[PDB]
């Protein structure tokens, strides 16, 4: 009576896991991890992010408030236009959609299942 | 490999399998008792008319008049929220929502962990 | 040695308070408070906001998730286009700017005051 | 009534009156001692050159090489942050910032409360 729900939710998930969207997500992440300059940009973004946040909580009186804010905007724009990053971020969403269409589908045949 | 149609079907069955639960079954039962209740049916029609009267008071630019009716509507909804039959419904709805949430989560979390080999 | 700072910060504030930007902010708020339909829209926005937030924390499975979200967007758009609201929200910012130009000015002749 | 020029002048004097404080005075004093310090001057030039070398390793697409220098820069900054003379500076800077914040706040708060008669 209880397992019958887990077992089917596990099937549905293992299905999504061996779906076209998943096999893609995988390969895009592999392409990104193996890419080195995307790595260069990512490591940088990591550093600038921290700096930004520190300055941000220090307030607008900070000497590099304007600068670190540009540095932040700019590094984002390097990720935004990096193919391997872009490719993965798209692949991530395609999967996120699969997840939500499923979430919606579960909710639909419960709302209508009352009538 | 599976297409989105396979996965949407697999989900539509789990959705029925979720309609086949204590929780959902309780929900319909409280849902039955609130429109059956003729105190709830009284207010939902008292306010239904009061709402339609407000449409007229929108056209007829009357500050004091439209807010007399407005203050009477909002208070009548809060008063309707104190009925124990709807109080039961509001809870059962939340309980159903939690199972749906839990189901949805257990799914995304398996996927998000297992995805990277 | 201590009061000399408060007294001047109080002068600067009492100046801003009897500035053109302030006398305007005042009259715009009076115009808005005295306006009744702007009031109708505002009272409504107050109600929808609460409803929105409740539904928002209930999650996307809620029956009126889509509806209350539209109702939210739409009432905002009624404030956005209400003249008396718009007028006041502009007047609010003009003052907020006065405040910031001052904040900046205090910070400038401290940074350069080192040299 | 006053124009924005009157108010910007009134502020520019308070700014000097703020430069005429214990806090700001302490700040310049710690500021003096860090570039006077030839351990700080060592690292700020060691890293200054290391930074310029990284520009070359950007052109010359070399993953391992650019991150060898990168890992050496970031660690050398953290090591520079452990110098007590700069540690003093970082604090005095914060103390100055707080007075500037407090001043700015006391001003907006008087205005935002008093504005509506």
Author numbering:
A (entry chain A), C (entry chain A): 6 to 120
B (entry chain B), D (entry chain B): 3 to 119
Task: Show the paper's wording.
In fact, superposition of RicA dimer and of RicAF revealed a root mean square deviation (RMSD) value for 166 aligned Cα of 0.982 Å. Thus, we tentatively conclude that RicAF is a tetramer in vitro, consisting of two molecules each of RicA and of RicF, while RicA is a homodimer. Because there is no evidence for a RicA tetramer, it would appear that the association of RicA with itself precludes tetramerization and, indeed, the tetramerization interface between RicAF dimers involves only RicA-RicF contacts (rather than RicA-RicA or RicF-RicF contacts).
We show here that the complex is a 1:1:1 heterotrimer, and we present the X-ray crystal structures of a RicAF heterotetramer and of a RicA dimer.
